[PDB]
Design a binder for this molecule. Structure first.
Ligand SMILES: Cc1cc2nc3c(=O)[nH]c(=O)nc-3n(C[C@H](O)[C@H](O)[C@H](O)COP(=O)(O)OP(=O)(O)OC[C@H]3O[C@@H](n4cnc5c(N)ncnc54)[C@H](O)[C@@H]3O)c2cc1C
Ligand SMILES: Cc1cc2nc3c(=O)[nH]c(=O)nc-3n(C[C@H](O)[C@H](O)[C@H](O)COP(=O)(O)OP(=O)(O)OC[C@H]3O[C@@H](n4cnc5c(N)ncnc54)[C@H](O)[C@@H]3O)c2cc1C
Lengths: 588, 593
């Protein structure tokens, strides 16, 4: 067992040090490499029960069995004696840097997973190179280091969500005694975008510098994979180059799909454009039903905008449809108009964008309904939230032969390994993995540890909790009710559910029976909580804690035994009693 | 033992039916009892691991082994044919009403635990009586059914807390692009208390109906447990009677302590008085350092008040002390003055409460410091929050023999049983139990079930999560740091921790590195999470979910495995790596990277 583990580890590590805490020579060397500013991976043999047979199995690599044993890229370099010998002449900084390639690792793409990976690898020695190029949107939009989430994703999305939530905090303030007129108050999109952009702006820098502070060579270059070890980089002005790499990680992410219809690319905008947009979108049509679509439709509405969402079939496909229904309903009951069962045929420009005045154009959206009826309306802005796609034909020469799936995504074994043994893929592009930022970060960190630090641990992609950040938030962990029903059958699935009202809402004279949560369990299995769902404020803060207990395989009995914190939204989980089969109402 | 149980179920349950889920004549008997509006507990034997043992063992009460078998108050009343025979002759509703005592249960205290228990026992066919009487405070303040939490506790507490959060959310709006100065806006306290009371009003009524709906006899009366089964009662106009009850539930709650100093009861108020006070408190002094003390100081400050807090010794005794300091230092930095190491000596009236203008008085607070300096300041109102005492001397007639402890609290077994074998106490009074609402409700329900439903499960009192609702909230679950070391030794205790900033706080320009969270773990036992602590927004919402995993015995490995939800405050618990004994600083370096 250990024979194969050790065979892969030393071969792939850049700067590694086998050691004991119990061996004095081993700790003395750690002191030296520290004041020599050498980053190395430390395997501690006294803290492992696979280790009993390592010193004996290091005879095949260096013909010795004493600790410490420092390796550099598969080949041995020396123990306490040879390390100090190489130190007292400045020769250590020259020996560690010795490399078969330009870099131990090249990371193509500087987004959530990309950056996370490069930063970790560098910690254990790897001379790392992270490449990031942002390709302009049709209309011309670009941004700094950080990837999707930082620049055009979670960060702006949630700050804008926040601006939107505060719209109703202002309303509620009045009921709680605060003497302010909500009617007289308005929102300045422009002010808000400055705020948001300024934060993103400082995040771009944070990263840029973070890589510097980690001996990670950051290049603002478009990377192309020409051969299993060679990456072709293009700079800000066409100077083509070819750095070599030992390990390759593909972390290039996705971009927003445009529907294949006239006028779309020319007059329509994606989420890429929305977050840095100079002027308030105005009367807006969102075309799509992804969490991206409803999130954006949701915060534009809250900022006093005229918002329509065009929906071809169902909202939030993949998500639990009872909950998606309740999400959509909340939004409809609050001004988001829906064009149900409807597609766009074309987008025609009625009016151009006024820059000198900072105001949107007018656009005409021609489309049809399912029953063939026409659709025709004028919108100031058209936003296209119809899925995202990886564009790896910009990154991969087919002649390297990295296998892509039915829809253009890197097919990987469970170690994020591609069909090409030194090439790896993480994040949004790794087929079948949930497409979320902590998922990519985790995937990346755990991969760096396996490659350049001899770790075993794999990234667990199951029961990864999510939050859709709509006007009323939706938090989820585990299977949707319908999925749970297909897996272990209807008679096996019990659903304990309930409506609830945040105490903050009572005085504020908001809805009863609109906030809602449910637990989806499997009775044959002790009533195992397969799935947790909640619609209400701070849904993500609510959900996060249970994602742990679910990972650990919680049952309904666990939830019951746990005591509530009062007054909170989240507690209502701890005292759930009404099941769906009983037909009893879940209202208060 | 399996038999030991059965005896306990037949002798205690008001109305119980023994059953199988598959047996058609059980289904018929069930349906029949539902149509005749009869409430009963049920035990489905086909889903009890000791099933065939209990069934054969039933013969000692009924003489039969068949199902179903109906029992009322320990009297076996018949098989299917017998019970069907009773149903169409309509004699059934009278056979369940037959009882030796007036009620199967007298609950004394219509508060959190009392109501919770009341409603629960009632559902299984136990005849139930909830007693509630609200003793007015010194200045003469009273409220309706519900208890402390409903009228003068959690509900008004967090509602006022919410109003304090809105203050800072008005500042925040401006940065997020909204058109308001929030520098000229003021807060109208009169409007807020109308709203807060309006709600407590509807909860008063709500709970009253709830009891009636479950056929619980609600008496707005003072309850004296005069004998093991006798409860003497005084209604609205000193008219006395007596009612009997098989089993008694004490859930009388505590009331706020006062100091032994002149002027206190005369000129000062307690939290009971605060949440209905018609005038704005004005320059307020809060004497204490309990969560009530801090919370009330917190939102009063935020609501535009001049607030000083006099601490005898330490902030939040009982709570992890590192967390208590941070909690305090926040409040100080946000305009809450603290007279530290300080106790009051007396209070004197300088102006009388203008009760026709909605304006406070003026009070002289003479006090001395830990060393001598003699403290002496004026305050428009003064609020005492020095802990809360049980008034069992007002309820429990001495001659019964129910053991109280050092502090006047009912000593119970871990099945809530007092020294008098049929009397139980639950909630704030059950000594040495965490004094919280969801505790008092869990205790009540679980008790009611054990008795009248034949359940076995007790209330788990270990690792109960809390959240102090100060300006920046404090959520906590399990052992403090000074207790994890104190019990398992420094060498065993590994503390992971980290500062954080809400993404919401960035644009709004609030503090980086004031929010803090930590995980007190134990090396030997696989890094078992013994404690979780969090200072930051929505701390209640954050903590709750983890209190479930903590319960099941969570290890750091478990937090590590779990993916974060981005962007949330709570997610910082999943990537914690920095430890204390390794020396690395908690501070989040920058907008990271
Ligand atoms: C509007 C929106 C909101 C979202 N909200 C959330 C949320 O709230 N919570 C959550 O968990 N997730 C959210 N996500 C998803 C999240 O953004 C992704 O899961 C995350 O970006 C995955 O990171 P990645 O490294 O795989 O790809 P990316 O972050 O996109 O990184 C890829 C980077 O590589 C660059 N690149 C591409 N090709 C090359 C090449 N030729 N050479 C050099 N560089 C290249 C790209 O420009 C890009 O910057 C949201 C996504 C969107 C679109
Ligand atoms: C300011 C404040 C804030 C709080 N905030 C929280 C919080 O945020 N979260 C939390 O979990 N807990 C909180 N608590 C604690 C919570 O209020 C108590 O833990 C809970 O109310 C205990 O319920 P109980 O049934 O044991 O007592 P109570 O709810 O007080 O029930 C006692 C009731 O019985 C009545 N009574 C007394 N004697 C008799 C008698 N002789 N006959 C008939 N009736 C009688 C009393 O009038 C009273 O209404 C707070 C407490 C206070 C004071």
């Amino acid at each position: 067992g250990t024979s194969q583990w050790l065979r892969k580890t030393v071969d792939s590590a850049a700067v590694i040090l086998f050691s004991k805490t119990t061996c004095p020579y081993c700790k003395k060397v750690k002191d030296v490499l520290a004041e020599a500013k050498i980053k190395h991976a430390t395997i501690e043999l006294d803290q492992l029960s696979n280790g009993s047979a390592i010193q004996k199995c290091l005879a095949s690599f260096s013909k010795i069995e004493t600790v410490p044993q420092m390796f550099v890229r598969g080949k041995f370099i020396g123990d306490s004696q040879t390390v100090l010998k190489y130190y007292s002449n400045d020769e250590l900084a020259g020996i560690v840097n010795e490399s078969k390639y330009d870099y131990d690792l090249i990371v193509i793409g500087g987004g959530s997973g990309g950056l996370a990976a490069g930063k970790e690898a560098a910690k254990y020695g790897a001379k790392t190179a992270v490449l990031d190029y942002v390709e302009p949107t049709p209309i011309g939009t670009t941004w700094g280091l950080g990837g999707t989430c930082v620049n055009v994703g979670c960060i702006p999305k949630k700050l804008m969500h926040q601006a939107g939530l505060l719209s109703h905090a202002l309303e509620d303030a009045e009921h709680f005694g605060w003497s302010l007129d909500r009617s007289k108050i308005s929102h300045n999109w422009s002010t808000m975008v400055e705020g948001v952009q300024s934060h993103i702006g400082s995040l771009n820098w944070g990263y840029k510098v973070a890589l510097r502070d980690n001996q990670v060579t950051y290049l603002n270059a478009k990377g192309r994979l020409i051969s299993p070890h060679e990456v072709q980089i293009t700079d800000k002005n066409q100077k083509v180059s070819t750095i070599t790499g030992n390990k390759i990680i593909l972390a290039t992410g996705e971009r927003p799909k445009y529907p294949e219809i006239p006028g779309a690319v020319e007059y329509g905008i994606t989420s890429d454009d929305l977050f840095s947009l100079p002027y308030f979108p105005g009367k807006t049509l969102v075309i799509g039903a992804s969490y991206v679509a409803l999130e954006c439709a949701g915060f534009l509405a809250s900022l006093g905008g005229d918002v329509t969402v065009m929906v071809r079939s169902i909202l939030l496909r993949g998500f639990d449809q009872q909950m998606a229904e309740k999400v959509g309903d909340y939004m409809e009951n609050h001004g988001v108009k829906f064009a149900k069962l409807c597609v766009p045929d074309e987008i025609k420009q009625l009016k151009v964008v006024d820059t000198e005045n900072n105001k949107p154009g007018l656009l005409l959206v021609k489309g049809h309904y399912t029953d063939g009826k026409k659709f025709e309306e004028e919108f100031e802005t058209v936003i296209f939230a119809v899925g995202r796609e990886p564009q790896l034909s910009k990154v991969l020469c087919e002649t390297v032969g990295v296998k892509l799936d039915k829809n253009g995504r890197v097919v990987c074994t469970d170690d994020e390994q591609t069909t090409v043994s030194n090439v790896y893929a993480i994040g949004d592009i790794n087929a079948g993995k949930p497409q979320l930022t902590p998922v990519a970060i985790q995937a990346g960190r755990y991969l760096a540890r396996r490659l350049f630090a001899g770790a075993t641990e794999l990234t667990d992609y199951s029961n990864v909790a999510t939050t859709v950040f709509t006007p009323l938030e939706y938090g989820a962990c585990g299977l949707s009710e319908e999925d749970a029903i297909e897996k272990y059958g209807d008679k096996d699935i019990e659903v304990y559910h309930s409506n609830f009202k945040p105490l903050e809402w009572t005085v504020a004279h908001r809805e009863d029976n609109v906030c809602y949560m449910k637990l989806v369990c499997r009775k044959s299995d002790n009533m195992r909580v397969l799935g947790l769902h909640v619609l209400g404020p701070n849904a993500g803060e609510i959900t996060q804690g249970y994602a742990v207990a679910i990972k650990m395989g919680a049952t309904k009995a666990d939830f019951d035994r746990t005591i509530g914190i009062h007054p909170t939204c989240s507690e209502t989980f701890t005292t759930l009693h009404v099941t769906k089969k009983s037909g009893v109402s879940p209202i208060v």
